[PDB]
C-alpha cells in the first residue's frame, strides 16, 4: 500500500500535545453545534412539542429592538 | 523623629533660593524657602475657600461652590462677590503647586538623585494650567474655567462635555483613556509580581530575577525587564496627562462642531 509507514507519525509529533488538542477541540465543538442548532427552527426545548409547559403570554408580538424590558417571563414569541 | 539610619544624610546645601536661612527640618518635614511659600499659599487658599463657603447658602461639605466670573468680564477683573474671589484663589493654587515642585528639586539635589519626580509632576501642573489659563485665554474669557466645589465642578464637566453632543468621539480623549486603562493594568501586574517573588509558597526560598523573567515568558511569551517596567510606568502616566491637556485645548478653540463629525475625514479619504 501507500499508507504502510503512517505509524511513524508519532516519532516527530508529540502524542501528549495531540491528545490535549483533540479533547479540547471536540468538547468546544460539541457546545458550539448545540448552541447553533438551538438558535434556529430546529430548536427542541421551546418548540411546544409535545406540549407547552409554561404560562406563556397570550399575545406576544414579533420583538423589535426599540422595546422595553418585559414584565413577566415568556418563551413563545413566534 | 529620625529613622535608624537618617542622621548621616541631613547635611546642608543643595538649595535654589534662600540659602542657609530656611535650611532646617520641622519634625520629619524639610522646610526651605519653598516650604514656607507652599504652606503660606495653601493656608491662604484654604481660608479663602472657607470664607467663600461662609457667604454662600450652606456649609455642607458636598454643596460648597465658588464660581468664576461671567463671560462678559472677558479677561478683566471681576467684583469680589461675583468672581474676584475665584481669581485670588486660583492665583494661590498656582503659587502652591509650583512651590511644591521646586521644593522637590531641592530635596533631590540634597540626596544626590535625579529629577524624575518633579519632572513628572510638571505635567499635572500643565493640565491644570491648560484648564484655567490657556484655554480661557484662547477663547477670550476667564469664565470658561471650572468652579471650586465637589459635585459642583462635576456639573461643569458634564455640561462642557455635552456642548459637543458626544464627547466620547474626541480623538485625543480616546488616546488618553487608552493610556489610563493600560496604566492601571500594568500597575496591578507589577505589584503582584514583586509581592509573589518575595512571598513564595510556604517553606521556600526567596526567588530571583530569572524567575521574574520566566513567569511572564511562560504566560505571554515576552518579558520587558525589571528596569524597563519603571520606565514604561513613567511613560504611560505622563502620556495620559499630556493627551488630556491636548484634548481640552482642541475643544472650543480649534473645533466647534460635534466631535463625531471630525472622524468623518476617515471614510471620506478618496481611497475606498
Amino acid at each position: 500500500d501507500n499508507f504502510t509507514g503512517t505509524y511513524k507519525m508519532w516519532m516527530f509529533i508529540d502524542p501528549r500535545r495531540a491528545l490535549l488538542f483533540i479533547a479540547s477541540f471536540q468538547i468546544l465543538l460539541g457546545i458550539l453545534i448545540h448552541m447553533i442548532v438551538l438558535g434556529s427552527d430546529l430548536n427542541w426545548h421551546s418548540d411546544g412539542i409535545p406540549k407547552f409547559y409554561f404560562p406563556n403570554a397570550a399575545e406576544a408580538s414579533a420583538p423589535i429592538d426599540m422595546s422595553p424590558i418585559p414584565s413577566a417571563r415568556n418563551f413563545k414569541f413566534d | 523623629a529620625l529613622l535608624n539610619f537618617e542622621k548621616k544624610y541631613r547635611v546642608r546645601g543643595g538649595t535654589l533660593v534662600g540659602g542657609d536661612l530656611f535650611d532646617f527640618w520641622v519634625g520629619p518635614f524639610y522646610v526651605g524657602f519653598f516650604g514656607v511659600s507652599a504652606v503660606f499659599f495653601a493656608t491662604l487658599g484654604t481660608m479663602l475657600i472657607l470664607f467663600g463657603a461662609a457667604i454662600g447658602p450652606t456649609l455642607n461639605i458636598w454643596q460648597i461652590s465658588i464660581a468664576p466670573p461671567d463671560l462678559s468680564v472677558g479677561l478683566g477683573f471681576a467684583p469680589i462677590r461675583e468672581g474676584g474671589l475665584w481669581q485670588v484663589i486660583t492665583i494661590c493654587a498656582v503659587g502652591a503647586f509650583v512651590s511644591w515642585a521646586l521644593r522637590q528639586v531641592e530635596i533631590a539635589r540634597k540626596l544626590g538623585m535625579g529629577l524624575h519626580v518633579p519632572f513628572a509632576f510638571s505635567f499635572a501642573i500643565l493640565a491644570y494650567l491648560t484648564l484655567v489659563f490657556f484655554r480661557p485665554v484662547l477663547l477670550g474669557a476667564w469664565g470658561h474655567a471650572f468652579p471650586y466645589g465637589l459635585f459642583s465642578h462635576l456639573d461643569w464637566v458634564s455640561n462642557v462635555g455635552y456642548q459637543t453632543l458626544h464627547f466620547h468621539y474626541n480623538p485625543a480623549h480616546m488616546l488618553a483613556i487608552s493610556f489610563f486603562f493600560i496604566n492601571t493594568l500594568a500597575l496591578a501586574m507589577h505589584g503582584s509580581l514583586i509581592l509573589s517573588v518575595v512571598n513564595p509558597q510556604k517553606g521556600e526560598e526567596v526567588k530571583t530575577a530569572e524567575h521574574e523573567n520566566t513567569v511572564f515568558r511562560d504566560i505571554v511569551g515576552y518579558s520587558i525587564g525589571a528596569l524597563a517596567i519603571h520606565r514604561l510606568g513613567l511613560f504611560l502616566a505622563i502620556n495620559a496627562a499630556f493627551w488630556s491637556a491636548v484634548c481640552m485645548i482642541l475643544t472650543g478653540p480649534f473645533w466647534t462642531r460635534g466631535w463625531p463629525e471630525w472622524w468623518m475625514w476617515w471614510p471620506n479619504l478618496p481611497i475606498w
Partner: protein, 66 residues
Amino acid sequence: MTRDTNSNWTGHVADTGVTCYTCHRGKPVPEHVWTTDPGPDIPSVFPSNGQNTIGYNVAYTALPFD
C-alpha cells in the same frame, strides 16, 4: 396645512408663522426631507437592527439611523 399651522400652533410658531418660502425657498421640491430608511445592504436572512452604520442624519454617530 399652512393655515392650520399659522392659526392653531402658536405655542411653537408664535406670531412669526410660516409661508411657502419657509420650506420651498423658491424650488418645487424642498431641500431637507426624509423617508423611512431601509438601511445598508446585508444578506437576505439577516433582519435590520437599525444602527451600527455611519448614520448621516443622526450627526455621524453609530446611533439608530432612523
